[PDB]
Amino acid sequence: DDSWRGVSMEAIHRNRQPFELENLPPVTAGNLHRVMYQLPIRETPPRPYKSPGKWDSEHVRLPCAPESKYPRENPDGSTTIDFRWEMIERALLQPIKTCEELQAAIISYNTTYRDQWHFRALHQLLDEELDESETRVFFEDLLPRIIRLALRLPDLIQSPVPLLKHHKNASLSLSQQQISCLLANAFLCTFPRRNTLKRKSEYSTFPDINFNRLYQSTGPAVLEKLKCIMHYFRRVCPTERDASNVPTGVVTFVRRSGLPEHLIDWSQSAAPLGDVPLHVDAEGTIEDEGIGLLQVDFANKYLGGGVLGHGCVQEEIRFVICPELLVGKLFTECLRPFEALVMLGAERYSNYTGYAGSFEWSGNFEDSTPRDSSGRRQTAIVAIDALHFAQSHHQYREDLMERELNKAYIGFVHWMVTPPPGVATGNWGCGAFGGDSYLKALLQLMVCAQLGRPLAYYTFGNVEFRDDFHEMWLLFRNDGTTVQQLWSILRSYSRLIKEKNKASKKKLYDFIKEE
Ligand SMILES: Cc1cc(Cn2c(=O)n(Cc3cnc(C)s3)c(=O)c3cc(S(=O)(=O)NC4(C)CC4)ccc32)n(C)n1
Ligand SMILES: [Cl-]
Fold first, then answer.
1. 305 in ligand 1 pocket by Cβ < 6 Å?
2. Which CATH superfamily is domain 4-19+272-513 in?
3. Phosphoserine (modified residue): where?
4. I want to staple 174 with a disulfide (CB 3.0 to 4.6 A). Which of 36, 259, 321, 368 is the partner?
5. Which residues hold their Cβ within 5 A of ligand 2, which is an ion?
6. Interatomic CA distance for residues 325 and 186, integer angstroms
7. What region, left, alpha or beta, does residue 465 occupy, with left being phi > 0 and alpha being psi -120 to 50 degrees?
8. Which of 318, 347, 355 to mutate to test ligand 1, by most ligand atoms within 8 A of the CB atom?
């Protein structure tokens, strides 16, 4: 009758309006929080913060650094060592009228990759997908705006951009405007030292950021991601007339890194599972129906996954409809097992249809989501990376159930004085990545019970699973089942599977029935 089972959405918000409960404290500058704009925000967009630039192992190597030098071959075949930022400016201010000339300009400061990079998805989009006039508008309007924005980087970033490395709790806050500039540079593949595919290299524990690998990819989902990105730049680049369309606010990136001190012993959790306000919806999406909640990103340990590539499932889609997330790739070291990344403030610019191979851009989206005191849209996303399984049976090992419990734990912790809003999630690391929906739902319930967060769970058209999970929360509620007690049952199922989906839930019935 209704799409959903369990408690209502009013309930998930603790009967207060969405957005009254916040997911992150306000931005303030500190030892553990670098802020790229001036506090407090008076004018908009925020005014950039000024401090000496850094070209070192602790900060982003910015394309405009005076330390960035580059060899050029010449007309006549000799070598000049020049400043790469000067070469980038010269290349991008030559006229560029075709897809081939764009590729040659980008390659002119990436000459190592001359015979490896071919921007086939860009050729497909401009030569075959758009008609002659939409393509003329690309070269006469859009691309000049992207270049002009990229070339303002020394004006918009006047402060070193720190890397968020392994095992450090740190935050970084930037303006949406600053992010549009960094992303324009990525679009034009300007970031130094971030292209090599060599196995052990300076940045190999970091994601890719230059957009070349997207351009090298194929198929319809890749073009639709390109359309999302184009659209973002139409939305946020100043037009020839004015700059009133430029976004006004802020985005914050928080590396959460758990200490041994924070590790839950799951057999000592007396938390009642049925006391979790659980809302299980078979329609709806996290980005729409989960407004006000901590929304989950079914992440790869490299933030963004294959968004610059062939990837086009849950993570990748979020990163092209809310492209400000992409800048996380620039400074976020890959996640270790007891770490997570919270991203607050990312505006949505695109609508979409489908999923995976059927993903399509389906139009403009005007985000009216309210901004917090710090100038951030109150869209809070946590990146947590599930394990992938070649073998489904492997996931029922005790150590790898604990791993996932602890991964979701560090993603979902609150660590603020005000009460935590609900989490909005779903079949995390399931489908083709090997995970069991039935188990991953319980692990997430355990974590929410333990932390005291409501849980809004989306099954995406699967009514059967909605019911099996609702019914199993009812058995917990009136048996007063407990985290440690469900852990005990789950460890039993571990040793059972060893000696050799729908059957996990059958055997809790059994171990529960005896109580
Ligand atoms: C209501 C709805 C949405 C969708 C499409 N979709 C999807 O198919 N999957 C995979 C699965 C399909 N059927 C299953 C039983 S799983 C999704 O995982 C999915 C996820 C989202 S989301 O996470 O809310 N948002 C994004 C993409 C921004 C992060 C949305 C649609 C999904 N379906 C079938 N039914
Ligand atoms: Cl030159």
1. no
2. Leucine Aminopeptidase, subunit E, domain 1 (3.40.220.10)
3. 3
4. 36
5. 87, 90
6. 13
7. alpha
8. 355
